[PDB]
Amino acid sequence: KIEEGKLVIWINGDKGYNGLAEVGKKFEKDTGIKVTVEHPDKLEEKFPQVAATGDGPDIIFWAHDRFGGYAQSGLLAEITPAAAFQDKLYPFTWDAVRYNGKLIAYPIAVEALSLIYNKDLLPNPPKTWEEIPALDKELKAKGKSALMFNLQEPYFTWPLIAADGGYAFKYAAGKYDIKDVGVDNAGAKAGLTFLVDLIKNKHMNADTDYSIAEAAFNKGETAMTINGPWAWSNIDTSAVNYGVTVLPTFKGQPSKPFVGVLSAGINAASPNKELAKEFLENYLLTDEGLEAVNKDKPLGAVALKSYEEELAKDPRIAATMENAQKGEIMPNIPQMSAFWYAVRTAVINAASGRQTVDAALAAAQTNAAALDHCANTVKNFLRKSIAAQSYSKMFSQGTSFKSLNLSLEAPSGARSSFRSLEHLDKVSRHYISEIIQKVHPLSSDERHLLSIIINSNFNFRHQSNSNLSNNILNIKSFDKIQSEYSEDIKEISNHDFVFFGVEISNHQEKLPLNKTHHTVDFGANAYIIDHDSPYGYMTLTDHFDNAIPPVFYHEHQSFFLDNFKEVVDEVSRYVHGNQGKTDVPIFNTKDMRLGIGLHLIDFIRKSKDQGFREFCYNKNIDPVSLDRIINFVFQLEYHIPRMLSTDNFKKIKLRDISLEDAIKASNYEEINNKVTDKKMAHQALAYSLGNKKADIALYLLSKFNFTKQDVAEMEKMKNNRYCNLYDVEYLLSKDGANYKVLEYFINNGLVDVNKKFQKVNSGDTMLDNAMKSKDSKMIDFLLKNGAILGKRFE
């Protein structure tokens, strides 16, 4: 791409590219090697684009701040000047082109902004920014202005932003701290507010750019401008009698220009690195070469000691260096580009009125410091901490782990450390190694099937009769729901997990494939996510009940009873490890697919059903058949710590939710949709009492005005499974969970406390039920409200 035997040089259009071309023509006269000098627009953006593809110029010129980024991307050759050459340039200039200890460019000249002023209009230039409004007012009497300079590039406004305390990156612990940015501190806000006020008060115009300010100063329309040494040549060509001097102070502090070292880098893709070194060291960085460039457009304070000794006698150069000494050499770290972009936007928005200074600089701060990275670090850490809490609860409260060698001591502090998570990994490790040792000599068909499983994605399905989603899907763990336990729940203590069935996903069939988990349909709303969770864990069965049932219980029983034989009498079994029936294998998300595949291989290998084996070892088994097999041999159960909250899901309505299922799930949406008149309320109240949904019962009673006659009607509901069998008063009194409903019915005169049951336990009263349950509170309530004690003959 870059052609050998010539040198292409890129340099900004505001520099002396014709004088550089003369240096190139001398190089050609000595060597026969042509030098082409170009000045493309947006050079500092075009160079990394074309150079990343191995194209671009042999030599790129820019201020040094851009070069570390280039060096980090691999675009620059390391330069190799020896002691003699390095001694010809000022030491601080070499420091500007050092990146990660290596020299990545030749320094050319030091650039700093100065105040340039028209001596005929303004014989004594202002010492302070603060006096510029009054100077402008004086000059406006003759239609002239005090100051114009480029407001489109933040380089020119930075000296003022920095004057009272703004900074780019603080230097600390031997480097620029990329997370200590001073773009939105008090000093930066004060400087930019001063600029914005100059514009608001019509002393400057937000649209002024480089060309406009230059034309105005060089035609005598404005008394002052802010620019670098490269601009002096055009001022010389104009009539204007000008001076170059220290930038004005702000709040009594010097303006602090960011100082650039114009530098020449060699493209890492160049086949002309030796020619480029010869040109730069022995033609350009000489008295004659720099003089030709400088005569075209002044370079500033050149890096070459021998020429700078004379250039520094120039008061304009002395003033450049005085401003530089008040400022700061720019960092060359890769973060500079983003910094400049951020500040550019802030200046332009604040100058325009599109944003306030505070808002513009706040946004620039967040961009320049890259606070997204830190916010992500915080979020990831807190997610990991939540997961560790769930896993410590499981491993430290679950008695099954104590029966095995897998318990965790309760956490030392007020929360679990990440050890629980590490424990998980080790646990999964255990169950992986074991199963590997059981099937290590793997056959070709077994390896092919394991590979098919490894490369499969999963749908994770959670069914419910609750309304768990709107735009956001929110599923809460059992422990989280109640916090807003029986010994069976204590056996595993995974009740701070959300539970999912598992399906193969790479198919175009209607979702979900399966609607039951261990024969239970958990509800009409099937919520499906299609991606793993980093802290989930998988079991091959329900964790507490690891028994696969006979085939006539399975959801797709006819497929297996039709197509297979011996496997029908093998699949019903306990799925467990070496330590016995309660040795439930546990896999983390990393190890899931391997462990599933290996356990499937083991089952298939132990099978006498050759048709089944051949069905599984079909090299072109489609994912639906694969899911059939996995959901037959196993009841995979995936667990996600604490909660699932996401906008990335599918909801599939499998069927209507029945009234009783809605009542049982406290699905107020379905309940309100269904219970619109008094007969539906009769049904819904009976269902609430039968399922001990006291809150639902009280809601219904608040929405409808129940009467004695309503209770009489409820007694006639043979189509309701509860009132078909039981009296209303029986339902009110059978379980203490309905106490508050009973109270309601008694206090509002809806039931007779002494009504004798006419259905199950006929002749009894509510007091009989209360005494049977040993519900002291209900017993006492009934007796306080006139219950009869004892039973006489009629």
Binding site: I386, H440, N455
Partner: protein
């Protein structure tokens, strides 16, 4: 840059068809997917460009490339400190909520509130991130 784990020769042995300490190139990705790695097709083909069969020596070096480093306790602390306006070591629940809601990857409000509740071990509306970060290290 790895040891003790030895990745898994175990896993390796599952795809060693002949037991010659080598596996085929076409299976490489699969063997890395069995261990929790997701290299692109381009990176797969570029690491195949280096060598078709691959042995366990070369297999270990390839997984070390893709293996990423856990964030350190110091890095977590610094990520918290950049949002600490007072430097006291505390971030208010409102400040942490603004941060985690408006910076970085989008989460639900529910997940953000759960993270805040989990981090606020005293229930005082403030999060002592230095204590909380030191506590999470075993």
């Amino acid at each position: 840059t790895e040891e003790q784990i030895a990745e898994f020769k175990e896993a390796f042995s599952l795809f060693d068809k002949d037991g010659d300490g080598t596996i085929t190139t076409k299976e490489l990705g699969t063997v890395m997917r069995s261990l929790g790695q997701n290299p692109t097709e381009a990176e797969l083909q570029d690491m195949i460009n280096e060598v078709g069969t691959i042995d366990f020596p070369e297999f270990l070096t390839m997984m070390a490339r893709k293996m990423k480093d856990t964030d350190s306790e110091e890095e977590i602390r610094e990520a918290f400190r950049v949002f600490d306006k007072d430097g006291n070591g505390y971030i208010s629940a409102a400040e942490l909520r603004h941060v985690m809601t408006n910076l970085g990857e989008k989460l639900t409000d529910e997940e953000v509130d759960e993270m805040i509740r989990e981090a606020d071990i005293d229930g005082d509306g403030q999060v002592n991130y230095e204590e909380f970060v030191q506590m999470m290290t075993a």
